């Protein structure tokens, strides 16, 4: 009747006595009745289940480095971490360890590197997006070792019983419906996420790989190799037609988007392509269509967003400092304003205790050099302060961009000008020292991208700054400075 | 949608304010591509039971090729 | 099938009256099935002996966790007693220390040493302790609880006291099951314990470690269990000793070792990365020159060895419980109304040690060269950074007053020297405790020289003589003679 | 676990004990100290077994117990200018 089916399909003794158990009781009630066919399709679900047939991984990590090379352009220190795991993963057949952790913006490609994995190893591949399932997709799979991802674990916060999914003490048996522990080792796990916001409990067992975002150079080969031919054959654009030149995805990247991932230059291209089709559909006078540099205006809109400083740099109040941010880095205008009144601070803008801190900080840094600048001695009482901070910094970041408010505050005292192609950023203590910072590589790819072309860093970032490895150094004007008076002899424009 | 045979990229997304023409342009299209239009807007067995919305719809246009809509997802 | 085991073994006489009695609910129906099957599979009986031999004892510790010498002793004190009296009903093992010590493995290394089976259970349907009872089956185990730092939360006390152990209910179990001949080990990253437990566990300190012990624990446990779960076989990979002190010194700055097995762990990755997909090499030899190659440039640095010119900024030691640290107190003078000013986290304690080193540094205005009308013409501002705990906060003290004689006077402190200590109005300098934990902090960080006040003299005779062997220590009893070590220029 | 032979403590051992090692008004740690001391004397009995009658005096304690923790009262420079011992 129905038994023929599952005494071949090799489920192990515990759940084929199971199946066995409520199969003999199924053929024994009445073939029609629902509960009888609430259990039809219960066995169904165990039907689905597969208790063996591992696909087969390919240990010749050669061909390996030539299919992730292959789809992705340039993500070379996170190749070597992932071809790392595939290593040991090779000569291993069991890793039993933690799991790799993909942490960056959204837009760098994250979903299509674990998709990218499962062509590697030679295993299939399932997305479980987060926002019983788990045997669904192991059904939905139909192998015993698939990548089973696990994307915005970060957009997760059953309410995280997850965790006894990932680590070896837990994964021997897995039961919740179906009441019958599976083998849920030998099933490779890549997760993702959006930032380092992922669950105290499931931080143990995660490997974190950063992926940091692209430069203009960077973005440039990956729509010229990557984006272009797959946005051409997403809408079949006939081979001799549509060259896009360099400078015009130039001026798409630089001018009519931001972001540190590639997400909204497919939007662009893609945009881009089916205006071109119906150019060419509405027609019959053109077929080949050259689109340059210049005609995008006439082709795609206006140029949404800024990118160039002539910028006017008589802003008395406003620098311009970086941001290690939640969702990867930033640009950042901290103002400060000066009115008359007792001596009381006001703090805005998210600031939490710390920034108090080091407010009354750079506070005592301008305090200690009032003569030498020419202040009023006495301001500190006639003149109360108003510092305000733009949101986006997590708060371990906290007081980077605190020489931001010094310059800040002795720009608004004395009525100097900040110049504004200066990204500054750093840590003040009181007495007139710039400790380090980190993340590095974010606030100096936030600095490039919008174009600003000088940066302050502390003196004791000359570690991380040769690890930069674009040439994102080559055209930045990077220098670092160690005192505060080395800040205030270049970001004011005028000598004090 | 006139070279490609089949778009399995996105959907066409009209978002207005309540007034312009974002249902009439369901009876613009419909008779634009030649396809029929169906609308659905929004707010087993056992007893007898009747068949999933979608398909009674299916059923209520009887082609295979239909220009669906899906008004008010925000209601 | 179900009636011929519901005996089980000379179980006793309440779970067979209850056993019976779902049993004949079954005769009159899966939840009793599953609800027999609970009370079937939890032991009772079975107890797995001990092992007596207590020098099997001492020769099985010290296979498994390397130079825990004074925590050992304690250990071997306790499984002693605990193995001549068949249950200790006293206070329970308290293991104390920064995370990355052998904490969640010491107790791991107690149950092949007695012989009970471990059980691990972290503090961050039956109850959950019966759960795991059922999940080891037997009568005796061990059954670590750890992270009290982190079902109620003071309801365990009834797990650990006798009244409660003898026979201990459940709420959805119905009977009563004794808890006694237990064993408990109980672990914990700091002391800060709700208020009951604090007395029924016996503290046993954890330190840190040395670069020394660090370099001895790598060569011997670390390097061959980190090979053994990725294959690497007995002369494809070498690791000089250098190479380790470069990890040790420069690629992290931490008390524990869990770091040092990411670093290393990270190393043997790219290692057997480097053997796949190279053909030529098979010997990969990694010194002190090879080191950052494989990994980044640095991480942290130490030595002071920069420039030493900061007035107003010595090196405080803090006893901060997650390992001793390092803090650069840092204080300035500014032209003013004489208003004091405290930043920096903490309340009011720092403010009666502030006061009393602006007292200090008042009452010496004449033989240290400063224009006595400081205390009303020039504000000052004194900073801390937030890395203490409540009690032994007016540590540092004479760090506050070598800050203030350092940037009223124009002096700069020497930069490798780091201070501790309680100051009181006459100069006198009180004695300060957790002594190890702050010096093994000052021997990690590179400090040459480091100032305890004297009254702590005797404690320097329990410090492991490897870290005594490195640090120029001179014990101080005036802050006069503070004032001719921490400066750089007489006064 | 101890039987009435193998271990005996001095008059000056638990005067070295109270002087030196305890500082309230009650008891609590002096039986701390003796719990402590008891079982180290344990440790001292089953890792070695030539010795069964372990004495301790006010000399042989500092092994057993570490150094003084807290001290005892004055005997020391009495300069100490402007600070007086109230209650
Ligand atoms: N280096 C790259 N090479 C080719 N395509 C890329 C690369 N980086 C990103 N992409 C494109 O980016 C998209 C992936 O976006 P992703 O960052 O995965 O979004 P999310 O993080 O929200 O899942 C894919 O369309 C992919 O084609
Ligand atoms: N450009 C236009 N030309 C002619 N009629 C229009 C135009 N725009 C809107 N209308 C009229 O307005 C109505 C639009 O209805 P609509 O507002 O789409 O309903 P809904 O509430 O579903 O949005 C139709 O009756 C249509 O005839
Ligand atoms: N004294 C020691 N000897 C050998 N290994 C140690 C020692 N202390 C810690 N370890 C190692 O620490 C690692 C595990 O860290 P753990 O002890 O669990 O610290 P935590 O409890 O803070 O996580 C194990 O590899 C263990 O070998």
Same mark, same amino acid.
């Given at each position: 009747?129905?038994?023929?089916?599952?005494?071949?399909a090799?489920?192990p003794?515990?759940?084929?006595?199971?199946?066995?158990?409520?199969?003999?009781?199924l053929?024994?009630?009445?073939?029609?009745?629902?509960?009888?066919?609430?259990?039809?399709?219960?066995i169904?679900?165990?039907?689905?289940?597969?208790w063996?047939?591992?696909?087969?991984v390919?240990?010749?990590?050669?061909?390996?480095?030539?299919?992730?090379?292959?789809?992705?352009?340039g993500?070379?220190?996170?190749?070597?971490?992932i071809?790392?795991?595939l290593?040991?993963? /090779?000569?291993? /057949?069991?890793?039993?360890?933690?799991?790799?952790?993909?942490?960056?913006?959204?837009?760098?490609?994250?979903?299509?590197?674990?998709?990218?994995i499962?062509?590697?190893?030679?295993?299939?591949?399932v997305?479980?997006?987060?926002? =019983?399932?788990?045997?669904?997709?192991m059904? #939905?799979?139909?192998?015993?070792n698939?990548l089973?991802?696990? $994307?915005?674990?970060?957009?997760?916060?059953?309410?995280?019983?997850?965790?006894?999914?990932?680590?070896?003490?837990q994964?021997?048996?897995?039961?919740?419906?179906?009441?019958? $522990?599976?083998?849920?080792?030998?099933?490779?796990?890549?997760?993702?996420?959006? /930032?380092?916001?992922?669950?105290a409990?499931?931080?143990?067992?995660?490997?974190?790989?950063?992926?940091?975002?692209?430069?203009?150079?960077?973005? *440039?080969?990956?729509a #010229?190799?990557?984006?272009?031919?797959?946005?051409?054959?997403?809408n079949?654009?006939?081979?001799?037609?549509?060259?896009?030149?360099?400078?015009?995805?130039?001026?798409?990247?630089?001018?009519?988007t931001?972001?540190?991932?590639?997400?909204s230059?497919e939007?662009?291209?893609?945009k881009?392509?089916?205006?071109?089709?119906?150019? *060419?559909?509405? $027609?019959?006078?053109? #077929?080949?269509?050259?689109?340059?540099?210049?005609?995008?205006? @006439?082709?795609?809109?206006?140029?949404k &967003?800024?990118?160039?400083?002539?910028?006017?740099?008589?802003?008395?109040?406003?620098?311009?400092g970086?941001?290690?941010?939640?969702? =990867?880095?930033?640009?950042?205008?901290?103002?400060?304003?000066?009115?008359?009144?007792?001596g009381?601070?006001?703090?805005?803008g998210?600031?939490?205790?710390?920034?108090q801190?080091?407010?009354?900080?750079?506070?005592t840094?301008?305090?200690?050099?009032?003569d030498?600048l020419?202040?009023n001695?006495?301001?500190?009482?006639?003149? $109360?302060?108003?510092?305000?901070v733009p949101?986006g910094?997590?708060?371990?970041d906290?007081?980077? %961009?605190?020489?931001?408010?010094?310059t800040?505050? &002795?720009?608004?005292?004395?009525?100097?000008?900040?110049?504004?192609?200066?990204?500054?950023?750093?840590?003040?203590?009181?007495?007139?020292? &710039?400790?380090?910072?980190? =993340?590095?590589?974010?606030?100096?790819?936030?600095?490039?991208?919008? =174009?600003?072309?000088?940066?302050?860093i502390?003196?004791?970032?000359?570690?991380?700054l040769?690890?930069?490895?674009?040439?994102?150094?080559a055209?930045?004007?990077?220098?670092?400075?160690?005192?505060?008076? @080395?800040?205030? %002899?270049?970001?004011?424009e005028?000598?004090? | 949608?006139?070279?490609?045979?089949?778009?399995?990229?996105?959907?066409?997304?009209l978002?207005?304010?309540?007034?312009?023409?974002?249902?009439?342009?369901?009876?613009?299209?419909?008779?634009?591509?030649?396809?029929?239009?169906?609308?659905?807007?929004?707010?087993?067995?056992?007893?007898?039971?009747?068949?999933?919305?979608?398909?009674?719809?299916?059923?209520?246009?009887?082609?295979?090729?239909? !220009?669906? !809509?899906?008004?008010?997802?925000?209601?």
């Amino acid at each position: 009747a129905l038994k023929r089916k599952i005494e071949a399909a090799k489920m192990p003794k515990d759940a084929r006595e199971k199946t066995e158990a409520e199969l003999q009781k199924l053929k024994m009630m009445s073939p029609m009745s629902a509960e009888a066919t609430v259990v039809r399709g219960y066995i169904d679900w165990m039907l689905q289940v597969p208790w063996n047939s591992r696909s087969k991984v390919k240990k010749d990590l050669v061909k390996a480095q030539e299919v992730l090379d292959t789809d992705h352009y340039g993500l070379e220190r996170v190749k070597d971490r992932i071809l790392e795991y595939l290593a040991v993963q /090779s000569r291993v /057949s069991k890793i039993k360890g933690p799991i790799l952790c993909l942490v960056g913006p959204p837009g760098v490609g994250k979903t299509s590197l674990g998709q990218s994995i499962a062509k590697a190893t030679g295993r299939q591949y399932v997305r479980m997006a987060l926002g =019983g399932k788990l045997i669904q997709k192991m059904a #939905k799979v139909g192998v015993k070792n698939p990548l089973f991802l696990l $994307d915005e674990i970060d957009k997760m916060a059953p309410a995280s019983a997850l965790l006894e999914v990932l680590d070896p003490e837990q994964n021997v048996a897995f039961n919740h419906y179906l009441e019958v $522990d599976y083998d849920l080792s030998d099933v490779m796990f890549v997760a993702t996420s959006n /930032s380092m916001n992922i669950p105290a409990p499931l931080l143990d067992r995660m490997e974190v790989i950063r992926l940091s975002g692209y430069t203009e150079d960077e973005k *440039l080969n990956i729509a #010229k190799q990557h984006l272009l031919p797959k946005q051409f054959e997403r809408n079949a654009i006939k081979k001799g037609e549509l060259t896009i030149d360099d400078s015009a995805i130039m001026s798409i990247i630089r001018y009519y988007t931001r972001e540190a991932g590639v997400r909204s230059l497919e939007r662009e291209i893609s945009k881009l392509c089916r205006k071109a089709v119906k150019n *060419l559909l509405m $027609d019959k006078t053109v #077929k080949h269509i050259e689109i340059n540099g210049d005609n995008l205006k @006439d082709f795609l809109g206006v140029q949404k &967003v800024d990118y160039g400083r002539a910028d006017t740099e008589n802003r008395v109040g406003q620098v311009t400092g970086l941001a290690w941010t939640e969702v =990867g880095g930033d640009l950042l205008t901290i103002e400060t304003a000066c009115v008359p009144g007792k001596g009381k601070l006001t703090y805005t803008g998210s600031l939490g205790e710390v920034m108090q801190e080091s407010i009354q900080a750079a506070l005592t840094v301008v305090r200690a050099r009032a003569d030498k600048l020419g202040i009023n001695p006495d301001f500190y009482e006639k003149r $109360d302060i108003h510092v305000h901070v733009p949101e986006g910094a997590t708060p371990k970041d906290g007081p980077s %961009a605190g020489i931001a408010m010094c310059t800040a505050l &002795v720009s608004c005292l004395t009525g100097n000008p900040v110049r504004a192609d200066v990204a500054m950023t750093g840590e003040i203590t009181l007495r007139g020292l &710039v400790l380090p910072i980190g =993340g590095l590589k974010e606030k100096l790819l936030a600095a490039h991208r919008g =174009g600003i072309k000088v940066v302050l860093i502390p003196d004791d970032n000359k570690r991380d700054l040769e690890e930069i490895p674009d040439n994102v150094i080559a055209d930045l004007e990077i220098h670092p400075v160690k005192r505060i008076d @080395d800040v205030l %002899a270049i970001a004011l424009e005028h000598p004090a | 949608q006139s070279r490609v045979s089949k778009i399995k990229g996105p959907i066409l997304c009209l978002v207005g304010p309540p007034g312009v023409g974002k249902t009439s342009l369901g009876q613009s299209i419909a008779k634009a591509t030649g396809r029929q239009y169906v609308r659905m807007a929004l707010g087993r067995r056992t007893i007898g039971s009747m068949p999933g919305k979608l398909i009674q719809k299916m059923a209520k246009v009887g082609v295979k090729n239909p !220009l669906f !809509l899906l008004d008010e997802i925000d209601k």
